[PDB]
Write an enzyme that holds these catalytic residues in place. Sequence first.
Site, mmCIF file in Angstrom:
data_model
loop_
_atom_site.group_PDB
_atom_site.id
_atom_site.type_symbol
_atom_site.label_atom_id
_atom_site.label_comp_id
_atom_site.label_asym_id
_atom_site.label_seq_id
_atom_site.Cartn_x
_atom_site.Cartn_y
_atom_site.Cartn_z
ATOM 1 N N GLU A 1 0.791 -1.243 0.000
ATOM 2 C CA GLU A 1 0.000 0.000 0.000
ATOM 3 C C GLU A 1 0.822 1.292 0.000
ATOM 4 O O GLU A 1 0.601 2.189 -0.800
ATOM 5 C CB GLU A 1 -0.987 0.067 1.178
ATOM 6 C CG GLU A 1 -2.189 -0.844 1.082
ATOM 7 C CD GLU A 1 -3.197 -0.430 -0.013
ATOM 8 O OE1 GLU A 1 -3.198 0.738 -0.475
ATOM 9 O OE2 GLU A 1 -3.959 -1.305 -0.427
ATOM 10 N N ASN B 1 1.793 4.184 -3.713
ATOM 11 C CA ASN B 1 1.765 5.642 -3.959
ATOM 12 C C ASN B 1 3.100 6.183 -4.537
ATOM 13 O O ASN B 1 3.129 7.137 -5.356
ATOM 14 C CB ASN B 1 1.273 6.407 -2.716
ATOM 15 C CG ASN B 1 -0.035 5.854 -2.201
ATOM 16 O OD1 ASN B 1 -0.139 5.348 -1.052
ATOM 17 N ND2 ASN B 1 -1.000 5.814 -3.077
ATOM 18 N N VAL C 1 -3.231 4.681 2.174
ATOM 19 C CA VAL C 1 -2.293 4.737 3.268
ATOM 20 C C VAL C 1 -2.887 5.121 4.645
ATOM 21 O O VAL C 1 -2.259 4.840 5.689
ATOM 22 C CB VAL C 1 -1.123 5.659 2.865
ATOM 23 C CG1 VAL C 1 -1.563 7.105 2.805
ATOM 24 C CG2 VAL C 1 0.066 5.457 3.783
HETATM 25 C C1 LIG Z 1 0.886 20.469 -5.521
HETATM 26 C C2 LIG Z 1 1.300 19.680 -6.445
HETATM 27 C C3 LIG Z 1 1.703 18.758 -7.528
HETATM 28 O O1 LIG Z 1 1.348 17.401 -7.195
HETATM 29 C C4 LIG Z 1 2.245 16.698 -6.277
HETATM 30 O O2 LIG Z 1 3.182 17.341 -5.811
HETATM 31 N N1 LIG Z 1 2.027 15.412 -5.988
HETATM 32 C C5 LIG Z 1 2.871 14.612 -5.135
HETATM 33 C C6 LIG Z 1 2.091 13.513 -4.424
HETATM 34 C C7 LIG Z 1 0.710 13.625 -4.201
HETATM 35 C C8 LIG Z 1 0.020 12.622 -3.534
HETATM 36 C C9 LIG Z 1 0.703 11.498 -3.061
HETATM 37 C C10 LIG Z 1 -0.103 10.463 -2.371
HETATM 38 C C11 LIG Z 1 0.383 9.801 -1.250
HETATM 39 C C12 LIG Z 1 -0.381 8.854 -0.612
HETATM 40 N N2 LIG Z 1 -1.608 8.553 -1.036
HETATM 41 C C13 LIG Z 1 -2.152 9.177 -2.104
HETATM 42 C C14 LIG Z 1 -1.421 10.155 -2.779
HETATM 43 C C15 LIG Z 1 2.089 11.382 -3.277
HETATM 44 C C16 LIG Z 1 2.847 10.279 -2.829
HETATM 45 C C17 LIG Z 1 4.211 10.215 -3.017
HETATM 46 N N3 LIG Z 1 4.980 9.180 -2.559
HETATM 47 C C18 LIG Z 1 4.676 8.298 -1.562
HETATM 48 O O3 LIG Z 1 3.592 8.206 -1.032
HETATM 49 N N4 LIG Z 1 5.738 7.566 -1.154
HETATM 50 C C19 LIG Z 1 5.703 6.626 -0.023
HETATM 51 C C20 LIG Z 1 7.042 6.587 0.669
HETATM 52 N N5 LIG Z 1 4.872 11.218 -3.689
HETATM 53 C C21 LIG Z 1 4.181 12.303 -4.115
HETATM 54 C C22 LIG Z 1 2.798 12.422 -3.922
#
Ligand SMILES: C#CCOC(=O)NCc1ccc(-c2ccncc2)c2cc(NC(=O)NCC)ncc12
Length: 206
Positions: A36, A40, A107
């Site tokens: 999970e 992401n 998560v």
């Molecule tokens: C403002 C703006 C531009 O969009 C972003 O910066 N997006 C980065 C981002 C968004 C969402 C999530 C996310 C996390 C958990 N559940 C659902 C979604 C992101 C997750 C992650 N990485 C992540 O969850 N890694 C686990 C160690 N990186 C960027 C993310």
Amino acid sequence: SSSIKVLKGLDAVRKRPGMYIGDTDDGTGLHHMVFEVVDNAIDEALAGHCKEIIVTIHADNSVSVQDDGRGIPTGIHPEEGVSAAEVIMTVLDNSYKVSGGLHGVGVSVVNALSQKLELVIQREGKIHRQIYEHGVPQAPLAVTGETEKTGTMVRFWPSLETFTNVTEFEYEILAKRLRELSFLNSGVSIRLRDKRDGKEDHFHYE
Ligand SMILES: C#CCOC(=O)NCc1ccc(-c2ccncc2)c2cc(NC(=O)NCC)ncc12
């Protein structure tokens, strides 16, 4: 309030964990916790932002997942009043599913089912930290440093109130599925490190 609603949802998960994460007694759920979080990071890599994901099994039987992507967004969105990261980490049938036949639940479920979870985000020049206990944040997401790197790291300690029988991570279950994940999302480097016995692997296709 959000507080009350947030707690009601975490309680729903804790009360019927199998339905959300998978079977809590045969290691299905336990390992799903890891996948999970990885999912992401995979999404971030499929979108072109993350090049490597590192999964580490710690000697205290926690697991960290880190990526080198953009970092989870930190700002306070108007209508929730806490960081976007905190909303992601706290706002919400897998019971008899097996292995890859389980559905993605988010998560916040991992958080609810973790005795402790630490979130560290490197974004927009700054290191941000938040700690949770069974989903309940200790404090609001906070700036703890300055950095020129970007990425997200989640480390979690699975609750022993939830998981029984199979309570320790099995390297081979993680290796097998992480290898499949790197194959299924070509280009993305995944590393697996076991601090218990020094085992390491690097999965990549190109
Ligand atoms: C403002 C703006 C531009 O969009 C972003 O910066 N997006 C980065 C981002 C968004 C969402 C999530 C996310 C996390 C958990 N559940 C659902 C979604 C992101 C997750 C992650 N990485 C992540 O969850 N890694 C686990 C160690 N990186 C960027 C993310």
